[PDB]
Design goal:
monomer, about 130 residues, mainly beta, 2 domains, 3-stranded antiparallel beta sheet, 6 strands, about 30% strand, secreted, PTN/MK_C_dom_sf, growth factor
Length: about 130
């Protein structure tokens, strides 16, 4: 009977791949914000990659309407909020804007009390 069997050919390797290229911070070179540059070094080479920073400069148009506000009237206990009406001078944008605004916000008449606060002591015995 012959039940012999053996086969090999895969020695362990240390390897040296760079899948997690250590990228450096992103600094905006052009202008104050936008296209930044980052320095990264892996394996045995150094290169700079461009990136984009979270800047708020991608606005163009929108309401394009000019409104005129004054006050907020007195606080109403009914709904707990007061409504204010404003008038716009410049319409523009598409065709025309509302000739009046209807806003509302909760406000108290007086006596500014705490939302809830909290008070807890700590009594303990040493023995």
């Amino acid at each position: 009977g012959s039940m012999k069997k053996k086969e090999k050919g895969k020695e362990p390797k240390a390897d040296a791949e760079c899948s997690e290229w250590q990228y450096g911070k992103c600094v905006p070179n052009s202008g104050d914000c936008g296209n930044g540059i980052r320095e990264a070094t892996c394996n045995e080479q150094t290169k700079k990659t461009k990136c984009k920073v979270p800047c708020n400069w991608k606005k163009d148009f929108g309401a394009d309407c000019k409104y005129k506000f004054g006050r907020w009237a007195e606080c109403d206990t009914t709904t707990g909020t007061r409504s204010r009406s404003g008038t716009l001078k410049k319409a523009l944008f598409n065709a025309e804007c509302q000739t009046t605004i209807k806003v509302s916000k909760p406000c108290t008449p007086k006596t500014p009390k705490p939302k809830g606060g909290e008070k807890k002591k700590g009594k303990g015995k040493e023995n």
